[PDB]
Design a protein around this ligand. Structure first.
Ligand SMILES: Nc1ncnc2c1ncn2[C@@H]1O[C@H](COP(=O)(O)OP(=O)(O)OP(O)(O)=S)[C@@H](O)[C@H]1O
Ligand SMILES: C[C@@](O)(CCOP(=O)(O)OP(=O)(O)O)CC(=O)O
Length: 326
């Protein structure tokens, strides 16, 4: 007989960055992590297990993928096979309703969607905590997409202790919004994974990253507990920039940032001066995310339109709900 599952997971952008791995093989992070989940961007993955298959197949956006991409999905399906009890090979059919490998967190939606589909298919009855544990093995950020609203990846010390949970903001997430500035739509030159790896191993500024990360997290946490937007913005803006500083310290150094990324930051500043409270963060890539309270979405979004082509400004709400079966 043949088992199938289909899930939809939304993406997440980290306010307090995950950048750098303690353990490269289980995906244990060097530091705790805090993100918001977005309902405008998402992955839909269906998985089918068949006695007929002899290796695992990934179909992504309609296309069978390459052979290091294959390799990557193989090692994950292996992890699923050990945990499930069986020997079945799978075929995966996934559509990214979100730009791919481009620094908009297709990793997080991808592997949350998959893990949750695997769960349904193989009838695993996984707790949210174990789900998060599973997605984490595919992609660090994916651990957080099991959940909605604000979520946190607790770094733990091994495979059982490293996972994520949700956080009550008493629905403060409902009054929030995130403007995407889509400067580049295409593949990162360097993948989140390998850039993280090089910065972590070699960066002369990494230690500086680590000495400040936890102080930022508590501050961000106290900000959500009080719903002080200004307080939250200030720390997440600095944290994000500090994350990128670590790349400048790598051997040899590098950056995901382009002139346009800077231009965007400036407009945020002008907005703040013009009395429109907003802050920016950047995943691994040139694109810029702008956190703004729902009230000033239109205004702030307008300010960008004076400078950017409108096929490039994209407002998302923050979703309150976690990953769903479909
Ligand atoms: N729907 C999907 N299913 C399986 N793999 C995917 C899917 N979407 C993207 N990927 C993989 O995700 C990898 C790239 O993701 P990343 O390098 O992490 O960039 P990203 O999309 O911004 O994710 P981050 O790091 O969390 S911002 C690619 O190698 C893809 O193979
Ligand atoms: C924290 C990030 O800047 C980087 C995370 O990228 P990944 O989670 O995809 O890395 P891997 O664990 O190797 O898959 C993302 C963000 O939201 O800022």
């Amino acid at each position: 007989m043949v088992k199938s599952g289909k899930a939809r997971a939304h993406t997440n952008i980290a306010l307090i960055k995950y950048w750098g791995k303690a353990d490269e093989t289980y995906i244990i992070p060097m530091n705790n992590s805090l993100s918001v989940t977005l309902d405008r961007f998402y992955t839909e993955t269906k998985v089918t297990f068949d006695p007929d298959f002899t290796e695992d197949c990934l179909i992504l956006n309609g296309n069978e993928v390459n052979a290091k991409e294959k390799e990557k999905i193989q090692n994950y399906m292996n992890i699923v096979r050990d945990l499930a009890g069986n020997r079945l090979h799978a075929r995966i059919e996934s559509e990214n309703y979100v730009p791919t490998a481009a620094g908009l967190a297709s990793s997080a939606s991808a592997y949350a969607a998959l893990a949750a589909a695997c769960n349904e298919a193989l009838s695993l009855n996984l707790s949210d905590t174990d789900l998060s544990r599973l997605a984490r093995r595919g992609s660090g950020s994916a651990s957080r997409s099991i959940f909605g609203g604000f979520a946190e990846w607790e770094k733990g010390h091994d495979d059982l202790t490293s996972y994520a949970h949700g956080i009550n903001s008493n629905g403060w997430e409902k009054d929030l919004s995130m403007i995407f500035v889509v400067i580049n739509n295409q593949s990162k030159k360097v993948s989140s994974r390998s850039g993280m790896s090089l910065t972590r191993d070699t960066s002369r500024f990494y230690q500086y990253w680590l000495d400040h990360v936890d102080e930022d997290l508590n501050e961000a946490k106290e900000a959500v507990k009080n719903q002080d937007f200004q307080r939250l913005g200030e720390v997440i803006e600095a944290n994000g920039l500090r994350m990128h500083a670590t790349n400048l310290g790598a051997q040899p150094p590098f950056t995901y940032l382009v002139q346009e990324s800077y231009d965007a930051m400036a407009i945020v500043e002008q907005c703040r001066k013009a009395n429109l409270p907003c802050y920016f963060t950047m995943a691994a890539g040139p694109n810029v995310k702008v956190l703004v309270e729902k009230k000033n979405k239109q205004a702030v979004m307008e300010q960008f339109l004076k400078v950017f082509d409108e096929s490039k400004i994209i407002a998302s709400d923050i979703i309150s709900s976690g990953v769903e079966i479909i």
